[PDB]
Automatic annotation (TrEMBL):
This is Calexcitin. Ca(2+) 3 binds at D115, S117, D119, I121, D123, E126. The lineage of its organism: Eukaryota, Metazoa, Spiralia, Lophotrochozoa, Mollusca. InterPro entries: EF-hand-dom_pair, EF_Hand_1_Ca_BS. Gene3D superfamilies: EF-hand (1.10.238.10).
């Protein structure tokens, strides 16, 4: 139903980007730690514009995740419920059926987190800043970003990041360039 290459890809985003308190289950608590994190890193005025965008955007993502994975409606999402969902999404993308709104919010949230500069491109400096903070070493944020940017001849616009994003979550092709989007496997 789901190859290990995809499973393993799919749990990294869980254990490394969602379970921000490292307790086995995604819940809103994890989203607060993340909000705090990005708030600080990018030095946002604590209740100003970006911080509040980030918080009301992550309320939607939780609510989306909540609604599309929480089988028992217990306000927490286990890896089982997390894989169980992502399988549907893979079918979905493969079978044409596009992703639910909250996915496109998460996807673009990650982009906007990176693109502090505002120019709708992610230069290398922006990529290393974010993903190092997540505890990926710098010999990867630099390693991977060259896989993602093809040496730097390709600008990494919002569209490019979407393609890469997609390949990360659903491509079973263990040679696909987007498989390095969250670092190196
Ligand atoms: Ca649950
Ligand atoms: Ca930029
Ligand atoms: Gd958690």
């Amino acid at each position: 139903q789901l190859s290990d290459f995809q499973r393993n890809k799919i749990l990294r985003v869980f254990n490394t980007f969602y379970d921000c308190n490292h307790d086995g289950v995604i819940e809103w608590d994890d989203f607060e730690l993340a909000i705090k994190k990005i708030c600080n890193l990018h030095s946002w005025p604590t209740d100003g514009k970006k911080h509040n965008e980030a918080r009301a955007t992550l309320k939607l993502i939780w609510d989306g995740l909540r609604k599309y994975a929480d089988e028992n409606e217990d306000e927490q999402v286990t890896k089982e419920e997390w894989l169980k969902m992502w399988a549907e999404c893979v079918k979905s993308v493969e079978k044409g059926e596009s992703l639910p709104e909250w996915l496109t919010k998460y996807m673009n949230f990650m982009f906007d987190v990176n693109d502090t500069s505002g120019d709708n491109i992610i230069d290398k400096h922006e990529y290393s800043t974010v993903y190092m903070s997540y505890g990926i070493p710098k010999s990867d944020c630099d390693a991977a970003f060259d896989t993602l940017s093809d040496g730097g001849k390709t600008m990494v616009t919002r569209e490019i990041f979407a393609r890469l994003w997609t390949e990360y979550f659903v491509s079973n092709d263990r040679g696909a360039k987007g498989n390095h989007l969250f670092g190196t496997l």
